Amino acid sequence: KAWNSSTGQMLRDKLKEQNFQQKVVDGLASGISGVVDLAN
C-alpha cells in the first residue's frame, strides 16, 4: 500500500536494510589494495 510507488529503490532499500557495513569489521580481510579509512 505504498503511498508511493517507485518500486525500485524501494526494494533495493529493503535489501539494504537487512545486512551490514563498517570498518573494524576486520575479522579476516579488508580487500586487496588499500587505504586506511574511518567510521572507527
Binding site: 510507488s5 517507485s6 518500486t7 525500485g8 529503490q9
Partner: protein, 50 residues
C-alpha cells in the same frame, strides 16, 4: 526506472446505496387454483418493492 504498474485486478467504485437502477415490483401468490398462474398478494405486503 519504470517497471510499469501492477494492476492485474480491476478496481471499482460503487454508489453509496449499493444499488440504484432498481425497479418497483409487487409480490404475488402461487394461486392454488390450477394453470399454475400466480395472482396478486392482497395481504400485508406492500405492492411497492425496490
Amino acid at each position: 526506472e519504470n517497471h510499469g504498474t501492477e494492476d492485474e485486478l480491476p478496481n471499482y467504485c460503487f454508489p453509496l446505496g449499493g444499488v440504484i437502477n432498481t425497479e418497483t415490483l409487487t409480490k404475488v401468490k402461487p394461486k392454488t387454483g390450477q394453470e399454475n398462474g400466480w395472482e396478486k398478494d392482497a395481504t400485508e405486503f406492500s405492492d411497492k418493492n425496490e
